[PDB]
Amino acid sequence: MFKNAKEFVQYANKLKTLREKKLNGVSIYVCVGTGCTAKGALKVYSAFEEELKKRNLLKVTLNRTGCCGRCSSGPLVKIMPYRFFYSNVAPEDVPEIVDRTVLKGEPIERLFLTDPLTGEKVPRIEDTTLFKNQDFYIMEAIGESECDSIEDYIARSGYESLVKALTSMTPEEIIETVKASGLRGRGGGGFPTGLKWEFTRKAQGDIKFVVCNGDEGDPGAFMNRTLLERDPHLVLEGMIIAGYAVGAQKGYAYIRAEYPFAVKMFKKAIEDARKLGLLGENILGTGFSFDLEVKEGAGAFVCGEETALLASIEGKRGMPRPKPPFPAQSGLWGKPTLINNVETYANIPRILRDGVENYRKRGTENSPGTKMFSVAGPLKATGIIEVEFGTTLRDIIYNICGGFVEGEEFKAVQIGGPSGACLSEDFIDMPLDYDTLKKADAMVGSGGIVVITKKTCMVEVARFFLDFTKRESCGKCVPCREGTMQAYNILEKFTHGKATYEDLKTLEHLSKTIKTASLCGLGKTAPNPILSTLKLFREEYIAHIEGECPSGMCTAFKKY
Amino acid sequence: HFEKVEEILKKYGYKRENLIKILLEIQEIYRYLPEDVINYVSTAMGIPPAKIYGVATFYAQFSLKPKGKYTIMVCDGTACHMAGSPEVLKAIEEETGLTPGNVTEDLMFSLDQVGCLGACALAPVMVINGEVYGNLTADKVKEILRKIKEKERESA
Amino acid sequence: MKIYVDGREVIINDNERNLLEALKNVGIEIPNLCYLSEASIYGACRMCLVEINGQITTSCTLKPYEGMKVKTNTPEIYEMRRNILELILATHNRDCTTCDRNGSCKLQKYAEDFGIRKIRFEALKKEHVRDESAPVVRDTSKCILCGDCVRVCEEIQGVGVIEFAKRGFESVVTTAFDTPLIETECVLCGQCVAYCPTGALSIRNDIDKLIEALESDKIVIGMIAPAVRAAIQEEFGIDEDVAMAEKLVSFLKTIGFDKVFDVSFGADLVAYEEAHEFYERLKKGERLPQFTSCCPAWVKHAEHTYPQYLQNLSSVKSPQQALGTVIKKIYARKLGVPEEKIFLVSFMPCTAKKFEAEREEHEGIVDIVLTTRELAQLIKMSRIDINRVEPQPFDRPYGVSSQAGLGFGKAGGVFSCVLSVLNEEIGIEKVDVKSPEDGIRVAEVTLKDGTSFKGAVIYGLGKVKKFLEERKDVEIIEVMACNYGCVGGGGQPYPNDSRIREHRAKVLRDTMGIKSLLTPVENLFLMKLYEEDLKDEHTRHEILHTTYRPRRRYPEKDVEILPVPNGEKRTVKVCLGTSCYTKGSYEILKKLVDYVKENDMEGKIEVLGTFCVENCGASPNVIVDDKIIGGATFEKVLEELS
Amino acid sequence: RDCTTCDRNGSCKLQKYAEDFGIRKIRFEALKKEHVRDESAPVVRDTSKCILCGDCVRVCEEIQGVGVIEFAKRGFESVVTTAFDTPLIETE
Numbered sequence A: 001m002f003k004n005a006k007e008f009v010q011y012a013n014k015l016k017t018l019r020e021k022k023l024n025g026v027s028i029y030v031c032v033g034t035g036c037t038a039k040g041a042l043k044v045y046s047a048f049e050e051e052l053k054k055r056n057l058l059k060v061t062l063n064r065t066g067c068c069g070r071c072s073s074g075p076l077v078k079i080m081p082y083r084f085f086y087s088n089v090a091p092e093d094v095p096e097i098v099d100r101t102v103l104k105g106e107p108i109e110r111l112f113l114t115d116p117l118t119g120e121k122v123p124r125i126e127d128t129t130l131f132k133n134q135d136f137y138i139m140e141a142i143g144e145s146e147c148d149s150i151e152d153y154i155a156r157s158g159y160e161s162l163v164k165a166l167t168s169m170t171p172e173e174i175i176e177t178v179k180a181s182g183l184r185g186r187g188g189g190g191f192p193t194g195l196k197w198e199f200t201r202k203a204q205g206d207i208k209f210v211v212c213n214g215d216e217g218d219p220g221a222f223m224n225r226t227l228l229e230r231d232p233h234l235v236l237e238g239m240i241i242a243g244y245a246v247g248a249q250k251g252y253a254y255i256r257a258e259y260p261f262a263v264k265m266f267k268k269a270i271e272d273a274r275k276l277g278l279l280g281e282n283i284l285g286t287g288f289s290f291d292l293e294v295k296e297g298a299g300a301f302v303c304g305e306e307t308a309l310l311a312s313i314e315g316k317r318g319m320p321r322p323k324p325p326f327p328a329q330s331g332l333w334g335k336p337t338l339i340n341n342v343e344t345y346a347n348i349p350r351i352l353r354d355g356v357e358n359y360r361k362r363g364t365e366n367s368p369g370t371k372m373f374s375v376a377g378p379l380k381a382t383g384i385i386e387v388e389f390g391t392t393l394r395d396i397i398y399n400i401c402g403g404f405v406e407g408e409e410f411k412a413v414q415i416g417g418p419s420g421a422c423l424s425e426d427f428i429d430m431p432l433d434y435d436t437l438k439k440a441d442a443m444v445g446s447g448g449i450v451v452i453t454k455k456t457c458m459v460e461v462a463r464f465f466l467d468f469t470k471r472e473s474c475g476k477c478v479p480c481r482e483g484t485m486q487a488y489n490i491l492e493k494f495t496h497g498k499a500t501y502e503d504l505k506t507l508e509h510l511s512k513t514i515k516t517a518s519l520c521g522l523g524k525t526a527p528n529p530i531l532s533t534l535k536l537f538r539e540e541y542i543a544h545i546e547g548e549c550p551s552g553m554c555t556a557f558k559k560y
Numbered sequence B: 001h002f003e004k005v006e007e008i009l010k011k012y013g014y015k016r017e018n019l020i021k022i023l024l025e026i027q028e029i030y031r032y033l034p035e036d037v038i039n040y041v042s043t044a045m046g047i048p049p050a051k052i053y054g055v056a057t058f059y060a061q062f063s064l065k066p067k068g069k070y071t072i073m074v075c076d077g078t079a080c081h082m083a084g085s086p087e088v089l090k091a092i093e094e095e096t097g098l099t100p101g102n103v104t105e106d107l108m109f110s111l112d113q114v115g116c117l118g119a120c121a122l123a124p125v126m127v128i129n130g131e132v133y134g135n136l137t138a139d140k141v142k143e144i145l146r147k148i149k150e151k152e153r154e155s156a
Numbered sequence C: 001m002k003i004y005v006d007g008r009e010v011i012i013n014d015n016e017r018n019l020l021e022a023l024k025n026v027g028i029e030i031p032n033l034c035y036l037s038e039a040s041i042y043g044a045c046r047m048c049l050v051e052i053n054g055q056i057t058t059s060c061t062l063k064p065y066e067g068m069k070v071k072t073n074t075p076e077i078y079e080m081r082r083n084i085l086e087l088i089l090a091t092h093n094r095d096c097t098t099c100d101r102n103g104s105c106k107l108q109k110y111a112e113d114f115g116i117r118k119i120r121f122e123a124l125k126k127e128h129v130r131d132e133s134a135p136v137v138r139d140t141s142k143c144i145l146c147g148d149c150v151r152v153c154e155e156i157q158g159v160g161v162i163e164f165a166k167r168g169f170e171s172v173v174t175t176a177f178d179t180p181l182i183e184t185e186c187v188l189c190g191q192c193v194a195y196c197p198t199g200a201l202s203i204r205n206d207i208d209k210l211i212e213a214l215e216s217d218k219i220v221i222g223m224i225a226p227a228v229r230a231a232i233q234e235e236f237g238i239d240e241d242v243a244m245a246e247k248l249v250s251f252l253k254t255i256g257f258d259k260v261f262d263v264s265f266g267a268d269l270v271a272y273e274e275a276h277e278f279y280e281r282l283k284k285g286e287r288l289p290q291f292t293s294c295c296p297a298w299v300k301h302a303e304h305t306y307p308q309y310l311q312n313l314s315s316v317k318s319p320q321q322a323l324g325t326v327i328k329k330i331y332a333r334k335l336g337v338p339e340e341k342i343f344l345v346s347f348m349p350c351t352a353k354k355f356e357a358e359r360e361e362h363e364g365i366v367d368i369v370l371t372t373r374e375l376a377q378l379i380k381m382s383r384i385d386i387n388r389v390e391p392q393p394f395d396r397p398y399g400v401s402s403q404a405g406l407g408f409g410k411a412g413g414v415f416s417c418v419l420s421v422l423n424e425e426i427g428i429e430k431v432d433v434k435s436p437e438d439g440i441r442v443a444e445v446t447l448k449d450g451t452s453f454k455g456a457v458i459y460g461l462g463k464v465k466k467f468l469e470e471r472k473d474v475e476i477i478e479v480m481a482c483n484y485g486c487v488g489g490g491g492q493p494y495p496n497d498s499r500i501r502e503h504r505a506k507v508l509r510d511t512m513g514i515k516s517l518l519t520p521v522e523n524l525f526l527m528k529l530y531e532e533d534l535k536d537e538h539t540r541h542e543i544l545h546t547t548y549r550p551r552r553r554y555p556e557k558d559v560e561i562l563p564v565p566n567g568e569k570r571t572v573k574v575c576l577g578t579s580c581y582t583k584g585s586y587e588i589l590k591k592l593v594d595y596v597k598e599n600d601m602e603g604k605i606e607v608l609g610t611f612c613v614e615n616c617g618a619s620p621n622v623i624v625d626d627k628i629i630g631g632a633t634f635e636k637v638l639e640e641l642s
Numbered sequence D: 001r002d003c004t005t006c007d008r009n010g011s012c013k014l015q016k017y018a019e020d021f022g023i024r025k026i027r028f029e030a031l032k033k034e035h036v037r038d039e040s041a042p043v044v045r046d047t048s049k050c051i052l053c054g055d056c057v058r059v060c061e062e063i064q065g066v067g068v069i070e071f072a073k074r075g076f077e078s079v080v081t082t083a084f085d086t087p088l089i090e091t092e
């Protein structure tokens, strides 16, 4: 395959045959994605390894898979010939699994997944009500895909789209199909990706760059790192296709150093692709050159800004600058640069493989495709979910996540982190979209979701988000640097039951200044939580001015 | 006379574009960024020390004080914060007498408040040397801190 | 391009970068705190808000297009601008009476104009830095984080010793690790101070020492620098004035100065000595290229950056030190008074001269150095109309000087003086001067006999690096740390932009024009000084020559766990690297800390922490009395401590 | 010494002398005074900025004939104030 596409197709067909052969036999996949490893997934993998080796009956295969969307349901394991799904797999009962299931195959009722809606246990996740209520378009082969294997990705039809784009298509038609598909920027803005690719390609310059923004843009979201650890090669293929489309010969992936697994997995994927020839001086003998490199993020929320990201990649402080000239013309080292989210690049190859009409079958007429989310807070089933761009908050909260834990009620929902919006029940029955809710003082955001319950204080929520923003400000412009700290001080005064009406008016008027006069998006959206809670939970602020806290948690007045 | 630092600098070829990665490597070697070490790096790469200091103090992963023997990493994400992270931080403070970003006298404990760890199902979540303790409360935090203190005190 | 501002027709310009500059060119001012000096950029203050098509935006980053309707004043913009100004003033150290920018501060003027009388926001506390260890004083509590000083020190001076650190509310412009500026590679050129729009960067005021000296019984002697007389007139809102030095002499004598001399005499003496030194170097073809030592900032920069060129630096000391040594060692004997009785006051335009006067090689020669601003403050205290003051000449025998000596005050002065001396001693067939760049000039000089050389004049530090790296065809290089020479020194009146510096150079040129004697040798007092005092080479070397030593940081800066401020102790340092931490290092540290907790009542033991000692793969390492142990453990460090 | 929030900022003789005299530090301790601030009336009082020149007293008594402000106490505690520190809006 290091010469042309014929040998690549031969290799892919043989790997498909090998994958089917292995799948037909007994095989094991343990979800080693974040969350499950926090519960002891690595110990479960070690237990399987040691048990299958001491008995020495490995024709069983032990593999590591990515997030299966049920992070809360303990470590996740499934056996292929009978696609049983196991949850809360303790390292201590692994010998029981090996003895009772791997060899014989008897179902284990005690280790299956529950059903929050119907209150029963289903042997297979594919038959679970939550799984049916979702719309998986990017997440393919849940629980049966090897994250650390380019061979598995190829055996699953992966990398076919890049070959099709190179051998058959030309950058102009790739950009045209991307524009027609209607894919929108998943970073949160929703800007049409096709327009961005056109801007980068039309920019005058021989050397261009492609940059991937691995940040989640939210301190309560893990969607992007989950996608990276699931299918690094999907994002890698998307980046290569984008580089071919915009005529770039260099790509940069920006993954936080705080995520060792994502960084290592992407490095492994890049090395494997280079070894297989998908990257290098000449890819598939088509005259197109491309290489990729992972840039570790030392940790700065402001580095999600395009200009700040470019500054951070070059080794400087992540300081943003007046956006025009846009990075699409003068970005990295002054050269044109294409900057997109992880999920955008993940969508790219999916759009290329399928058509435009087939892609647009899902979603709406402005926002085709799917949106991967990360639901948190007190709920029966929390984790990573994917839904089309037509679902409502109620669907996700109850039908997909199973609802709240007994003895806990809904108060509000966070949809985009600090820069997002605070929506109460009044907007729960609104279909998620980049336009339907972008006008009602809301936004789908990067994809993080957190549910706020009746025992959560909204003034406290605003204080927490403003504290985050105050810590994360780069300190370049006066509005953000100073006003965010002043607003945090005022919110702290509210929390400690020593605020007044004058403070309320000061906060209201300072929020408008911060939003309007701030340089970049971090400061512009800094007072979004204040504005949201004031518009939806004003009576709580008034109560705090009266030392009440109807939710009754701010440890500022009690037992007098 | 620095050798490992010189190895890193040669590996990344004294290019400022790799300054952040070089600093990360140096931190993983020394556990922090000593003044002498980055003065040497400054001399080797022909970059004023003030520039490296500005870069180092801008990003969170870089610490100028040594890491504690038991580095505590408390999640301050949205879900963890609403699940009771402030109580976890208060328990840590009242047990070891420190606040996030600080270190103890004998470098035994150090604390950092960080974003989501990807385990919101365990909110509130705490990490100590790669050991994640979920569903934590003041009682549990105090219990685990006391247990680790006894274990280390044993020395043996 | 015609636009609409508040509803009236306005013609701005054909091509413009942004609306703010275009309107400023027209004469329409938009309040802003970004344009503060020549090293200013746009985008940080956010106070230039204008309204266009409904949405508010900054005018400094808005491209003006034909037929654009812009409203520069709306109630929303007033609210936002006042909010931003109140935010700036809430955390600003508002003590203008003791501030160095009092009366010339844009922030103060805005606070006055915006009618800010109460702080609606809390004056929240920051981890501010107060550095007074050097003649350049840092106080970050007055910093508005404009970033002008950083750009000046990096892009203009080429040192880069001050940079932005931290982020958010803790953002601060500082040195690395908050190191005192005196201990950094700072050359003390004072250009950051000259460009700083607030009191965050200021010059160390030493007027109190001068007053207490004048009040005492000592003989106070003053000497004025050539560039001081070319700029002092700015502080009083008056135009150029030749004979400024003589009325300054009158004022100084009025306030109690026994003798006032001219540093131009010292400049002529230094030029004579340097000319002969350079001629010897040429005829021997050694220690070339030669570097002038008249600029202390350049000397310190070379010591920090070019230890190999320290032998190529001119041995002759600067005019200030040369004339001061002449005074203290010769004039005192001629007057029959002990050297302790003389108080030498230097009036300079430079902040690095304060450092030079305190150098270990110049100890006790110059007592205090006062900048031009400090002399202006002295004049303003008296309230005399310095314009009406009758001039009188400098005191003898160090009062007269040649045009070449007074030329020292601007770039190309010492090189021209040396050329004049050489021409007089041995004629110059022709001088051919080139201009490779803005602040670099190269001269091709041929002597009568036929021996020729190339001399270069470089003003503005930071241009030296490229010239020294790429040019090796010169035999003598004049380096001035400040653009335009000493007329743009750190201690000159504020503002200190390039237009004012060029005007100062013109004033100094006009002052030079009225000088009769043209070369140092024509200075008869100078030849007399050689004839009766500096006859032999031994005294000449001990009087007019100095030595230079390399500068290298000596930072230990190891972790302090249980430090001892002073006294005989054991200074036990425990390695804290990853390799050593892998087995026992931190636990051993805990053992030692508890040991000194129960034992070591006094400061006998100093439990200390240090980074890797390049002894890995050899068990945890613990330092004792600056000795290597290896395989360290509590019992071993104990026995070694015994 | 807080000129940014002062109405005499830019037109203050004391500010101009502080600038001209080169006062950059105060070796004299900032002693604590029982300063009086008043904001009850449109005319605002702040004795922390008072140099005790007595011009206001002469203006109020000789020129205006009211004499509601006058020198009180003595020594370091000398202050120009109203009778019994009464708020201005409550006086004549």
Ligand SMILES: Cc1cc2nc3c(=O)[nH]c(=O)nc-3n(C[C@H](O)[C@H](O)[C@H](O)COP(=O)(O)O)c2cc1C
Residues within 6 Å of the ligand: A184, A185, A186, A187, A188, A189, A190, A191, A193, A213, A214, A215, A216, A217, A218, A301, A302, A303, A304, A305, A306, A339, A340, A341, A342, A344, A446, A520, A521, A522
């Ligand atoms: C503070 C801040 C953080 C951001 N974080 C992210 C992020 O984590 N991921 C992302 O895709 N965009 C993020 N953005 C938005 C990007 O800077 C910008 O929209 C970029 O063009 C993303 O391209 P995309 O629309 O194709 O995703 C952030 C913006 C700001 C102001």
Ligand code: SF4
Residues within 6 Å of the ligand: A302, A320, A472, A473, A474, A475, A476, A477, A478, A480, A481, A518, A519, A520, A521, A522, A523, A524
């Ligand atoms: S808004 Fe905040 S993050 Fe953005 S440039 Fe200004 S200070 Fe920096």
Ligand code: SF4
Residues within 6 Å of the ligand: C092, C093, C094, C095, C096, C099, C100, C101, C102, C103, C105, C106, C107, C108, C142, C197, C198, C199, C200, D003, D004
């Ligand atoms: S910089 Fe000095 S003069 Fe200007 S406002 Fe601040 S304290 Fe007053």
Ligand code: SF4
Residues within 6 Å of the ligand: C136, C152, C153, C157, C159, C160, C161, C162, C185, C186, C187, C188, C189, C190, C191, C192, C193
């Ligand atoms: S005095 Fe000169 S070298 Fe020192 S910090 Fe200021 S600009 Fe930099």
Ligand code: SF4
Residues within 6 Å of the ligand: C142, C143, C144, C145, C146, C147, C148, C149, C150, C173, C192, C195, C196, C197, C198, C200, C201
């Ligand atoms: S020290 Fe002065 S020049 Fe430097 S950033 Fe602060 S205000 Fe600006």
Ligand code: SF4
Residues within 6 Å of the ligand: C188, C189, C294, C295, C296, C297, C298, C349, C350, C351, C352, C353, C480, C481, C482, C485, C486, C487, C488, C489, C490
């Ligand atoms: S050029 Fe003149 S004013 Fe500037 S540092 Fe050198 S001697 Fe001082």
Ligand code: SF4
Residues within 6 Å of the ligand: D049, D050, D051, D052, D053, D054, D055, D056, D057, D080
């Ligand atoms: S005595 Fe009266 S006029 Fe004089 S400063 Fe005090 S208040 Fe003002």
Ligand code: FES
Residues within 6 Å of the ligand: A031, A032, A033, A034, A035, A036, A037, A066, A067, A068, A069, A070, A071, A072, A076, A383, A384
């Ligand atoms: S990481 Fe295992 S289900 Fe999400």
Ligand code: FES
Residues within 6 Å of the ligand: A219, A220, A221, A376, B075, B076, B077, B078, B079, B080, B081, B115, B116, B117, B118, B119, B120, B121, B123, B125
């Ligand atoms: S918010 Fe703490 S682990 Fe997700």
Ligand code: FES
Residues within 6 Å of the ligand: C020, C032, C033, C034, C035, C042, C043, C044, C045, C046, C047, C048, C058, C059, C060, C061
């Ligand atoms: S002039 Fe300062 S932001 Fe525009």
Ligand code: FES
Residues within 6 Å of the ligand: C575, C576, C577, C578, C579, C580, C581, C611, C612, C613, C614, C615, C616, C621
């Ligand atoms: S880590 Fe201790 S000698 Fe290197």
Ligand SMILES: [Zn+2]
Residues within 6 Å of the ligand: A457, A458, A459, A460, A495, A544, A549, A550, A551, A552, A553, A554
């Ligand atoms: Zn509350």
